[PDB]
Design a protein around this ligand. Sequence first.
Ligand SMILES: Nc1ncnc2c1ncn2[C@@H]1O[C@H](CSCC[C@H](N)C(=O)O)[C@@H](O)[C@H]1O
Length: 328
Amino acid sequence: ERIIQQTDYDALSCKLAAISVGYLPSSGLQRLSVDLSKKYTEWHRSYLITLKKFSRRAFGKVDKAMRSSFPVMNYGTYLRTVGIDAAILEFLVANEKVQVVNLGCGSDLRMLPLLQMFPHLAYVDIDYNESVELKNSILRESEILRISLGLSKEDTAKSPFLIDQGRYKLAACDLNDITETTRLLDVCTKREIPTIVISECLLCYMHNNESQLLINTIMSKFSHGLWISYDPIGGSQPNDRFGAIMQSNLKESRNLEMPTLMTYNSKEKYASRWSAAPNVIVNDMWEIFNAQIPESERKRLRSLQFLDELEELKVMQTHYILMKAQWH
Ligand SMILES: Nc1ncnc2c1ncn2[C@@H]1O[C@H](CSCC[C@H](N)C(=O)O)[C@@H](O)[C@H]1O
């Protein structure tokens, strides 16, 4: 589906709007160095310029949405990035040899600083065939993105991989098909190696059958893992129409569906999908803003932009969550 692939252009507009204002990179929570903080800004800026070369339509939707970004949505992107990063970095410090499988990766460039910071970290980007062909073109075209991953300018990878360079792999795969998913994972991951499965904004666009079989198969595949899943919820409180308005606004404007939004309308119901795992934590993004983000970080974001409506940030961010299912 071309419309589901175009949701990544909204996710890239958020990431480039946060970096352009200053929200990211947060060098403390993401644990970036002085050089890698400069590289985080320079890799994302070079991804936007290279996206212009390969697409006028995709650059037009990313550029217009980025510059029309409000302070409230920049707070939602900050908590979204440093929340998933805090869960990744805790697992990568305790476990030296780790392999990551970013399901529904899109235009995510967190693997660039992560591979640098951890010498024994493998990584595996996975998206639709059309999406990963655009990401392969952008990484191989830009000179600075070429140096980060050790890529050539030409398409030199073979068979199931568009990129196959040492400790990073890019691959095409429909995740709604479980036969295609397990065939790819057999040739790019191992059972015994500790794992971090990232499903950032992926499982919301899938039906309940395709998403539940993806959770049960991947957890049963590895002996030791950690599933950091970010997604929206419809809201549990009565007269809370956040979920019914979101399904009606996506269907009318863009012809997009979030099938299991109302089904998993709370953070408890969302976390019950990973009930097979023994240790399951779950907190909405407003709870992560008040408990996980330090006082030094909140003062820094206040210096960037005027967040006039803090209650409007609470209403939005309570309808997003960060789940962490660990098993062994
Ligand atoms: N069945 C499927 N197979 C492969 N990719 C899928 C998929 N369903 C949704 N996606 C991908 O999930 C992404 C959702 S937008 C999220 C982009 C990225 N994870 C980020 O957080 O910045 C899109 O890029 C889309 O292509």
